[PDB]
Symmetry: C12
């Protein structure tokens, strides 16, 4: 079923909104070393919290698509924006895609 | 279930709205050392107040996602914005996620 | 009861509006020493007038969250903006949180 | 009760609207020593007129919150704006607070 | 009665509109000595024409609140703006206050 | 009564609209000596035409409020704007005041 | 009758619109000697064409209010703008005044 | 009558719209000697075409109001704008004046 | 008949739209010699194509009003804008005039 | 008739829309020699494609109005814009003209 | 039939949208050699994919109108914008033309 | 058929939304070498994920249209934007094309 792909919808929405708002904060002004270092850690934890809420099939997709940062290097503002954009896009794509596809399967069933 | 995740909604809304508006203030103008210092303390205190209003699952989720500032260093303007934006995003996603997920269950219980 | 938390609603609204408008005045233009010194005193009186209108449970929350300024130092524009923002956010959070939570308890009762 | 807090509504609205519009004028352009001096006097007088229209509880509340200017010094533009904004915010909160609180009592008296 | 406070409503509106439009003219561009000298005279006549239209109770209030300029000195642009703002605010406050208070006494009478 | 204050409404509207539009023109661009000189004369003439259309009470009110320019000096741009704005404000207040006051009497004659 | 004041309404509207549009042209860009000289002549002809369409009572009013330019001098841009503004204002005042006054006499007749 | 003033409406609208749009073009950018020269000729021609479409009364009115340019001098940009704006204003007033005046007669023929 | 004036409406609209859009192109940016030379030729052909679609009466009007360029000189940007504006204005005037005049003859026929 | 003028509507719309959008592109930024050269060729080709879709009358009309570029010279940016704008204007006028003229015939066939 | 011209509508829409969005990307910022080289290749493939979806009649039209780039030269930003604009215009023209023409054939059939 | 082209709609929407939002991020600010490098990898991966969700016909269409980046060179900001914009345009056209084409078939099956 299409609906079994997201095992914990409310959690995924919760982590997703956190990520989107962090990306918005980053876009607004230049960061410094300490916050870049922090955001990197948050990014790694984020992927795991997301995976906790998704079916294995999508964990494996997410794992193919994303990549944790080298722990011996603080990534730049731009790297972090890319890492977070990917997650936001995929997450909005994820929900919008399921709802759209589901709505269409119900429209075909009424005929 | 699901509603049981937030034991004290009004309290979480209250602390959340406080954090959000402080973030708005921080964003508006440059801070000084005393302001930063004060905000670090408010941050520590606000997490503690939030955790009081959350179910254990979410306390822990918060504990995994967040990191309190080192008490022997005043964090920068950017560090504080990231800390607060994380909380705002997560809290807004928390409530939104639950309403949305509850609503999908009620509509699935119609058919 | 959720409604017992604010013992004097009209007073809390009255002091809250005062605080919000002072914050707006401060944001609009640079202050000087005499007005900063005055605002500090108003801030201390404000917390007490608020506490006078709240249940003990919330007085103690407010007391954990806030902090009166050292009387031997005039705080900066930024410190005062932080101190006032916190109060405004918490106060709007307070009312919005109670009304929202109450509205939801009544919606669950009709089922 | 509650309505008994403002003994002379129309008078308080009249003095309040005067203060508000003076604050608008002050905000618009830089003042001179004679203007500041005049405004200090208007301030003293307006509090006295307000207190005439308030119940004793509120007279005292005002007395606790406000501070008349030292008569041997002309206060600055910023000092005057803070003084007036405090009054405007408090007065707007006063009326708003009472209507809102009265309305909640009347709606609670329906059910 | 609240309605006995303004003995000549149309006159007070007529003088009030004159004053408001003069204040608007003053705000628009810098004045010179001759016009400042003229405006001062108009201001003194204005207060009297207003008083002619008000109950004694309010004449005495207006007299406590306002102050004619020293005849041996031409006041500045700013002084004149303050003097006129006070009159406009009080006058709008006056009418709005009476109408509002009256409307509320009629709403209490229907219960 | 009240309507008897303006003996010639259409005339007063006509002269008033003329004054208002001259004020708009003056405000738009800098004048020269011949223009100022001409306007001073128009001013003198317009008051005389107005007085022709007013009841005696109001003629006198106008006479108290206004001052004709010294004929041996061309007044400045600012002097002319003040002179005209006084008239416009007073005339607009005159008509507005009468309609408003008449309307309150008619509504008071309903109940 | 109020309606006898304008003997040729369509002509007065025709000359009035011409004058208003010339004033608009003048406002838009600086003129030169030849066009100023032309506009002066048009202004003198205008007053006469207007007078041709008005009752004697108003011809005499217009004649008291206006003034043809000295034929031995080309007036400035500003003078011409003043001369034309006066005519436009008076003309719009004229029609608006008659229509307004007439409408009010009919409203009094229905009672 | 009144409709008999314009013998050829569609022609007058056609020539009028041409003049108006040339005025728009002139206003948009600086002209050269050949353009000015051409426009002077168009002006002469357009008056002649207009007069063909007007009743004798109005031909004459036009003849009184207008002045053809000296053929041995190319008029300036400002001269041309004044010439054309006069015609546009007069023509728009002409049609507007007639409709308005006709309409007032028809409404007066109702009662 | 008014409707016989335009023998080929669709053609006149077709050539007219072409001319209007060329004028718009010219207004947008500076031309060069080759395009000015081209536009001149188009202008001459345009007048003829228009004339092909009009009754003789209007061909002769158009011929009185317009003028082909000297073939031994490339006209300027401004000349071409004037030449094209005239055609556009007259053409829009032409249609608008006929439709308006026709609509009015039908309104008089229904009475 | 009239509809018989365009033998291939969809083709003419297709080629017309292509020309229009190329004109939009040309207008947006400066071109180079290769771009100009290419556009000249597209121009030649597009006329040929258009003529294929038009009735003989209109082929000829186009042939009279248009001029192909000399093949041994790359035309300028301005030359190309004029060439294309001519076509767009003519084509838009073509379709518009026919619909409008057809519509007037159908409405004339009602009465 | 008009509808047989596009054998694969969904494919043509798919390739068309790709092309339009590439053109938009190119317009937004300056390209470099590698991307210009890539876009050239995409342009050649595009024409073929389009042709795959069209009737032979239109393949041949498209082939007459377009031109693949010399493989021994990387075209400029401008050339690529021209090449892509042509395709977008023609494609939008294509669909709009067929739908419009079809809609008109159905309107003629209902009479 | 037609619906059989996209075997996994929700997946294609998900990967598509990810690509689109990365393109938005790239467009917003300048990237660095690590960001570019990461994006190249994401690009390779996203095509592979897309192909998994498409029918064989479309896999191949994609394979013909796209080109993976050389792994021994980090592509530029412009190269990445072109790569991503191609995919977005194609994917949006893909879904849009299918809905539109399906809709035309269903409406053709009505009549």
């Amino acid at each position: 079923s299409l609906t079994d792909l997201v095992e914990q919808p409310a959690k995924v929405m919760r982590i997703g909104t956190m990520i989107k708002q962090l990306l918005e904060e980053v876009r607004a002004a230049p960061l410094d070393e300490a916050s870049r270092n922090r955001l990197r850690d948050i990014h790694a934890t984020s992927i795991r919290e997301l995976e906790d809420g998704l079916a294995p099939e999508l964990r494996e997709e997410l794992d193919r698509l994303t990549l944790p940062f080298n722990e011996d290097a603080v990534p730049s503002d731009a790297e972090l924006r890319i890492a977070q954009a990917q997650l936001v896009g995929w997450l909005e794509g994820l929900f919008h895609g399921i709802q759209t596809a589901l709505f269409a399967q119900q429209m075909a069933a009424r005929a």
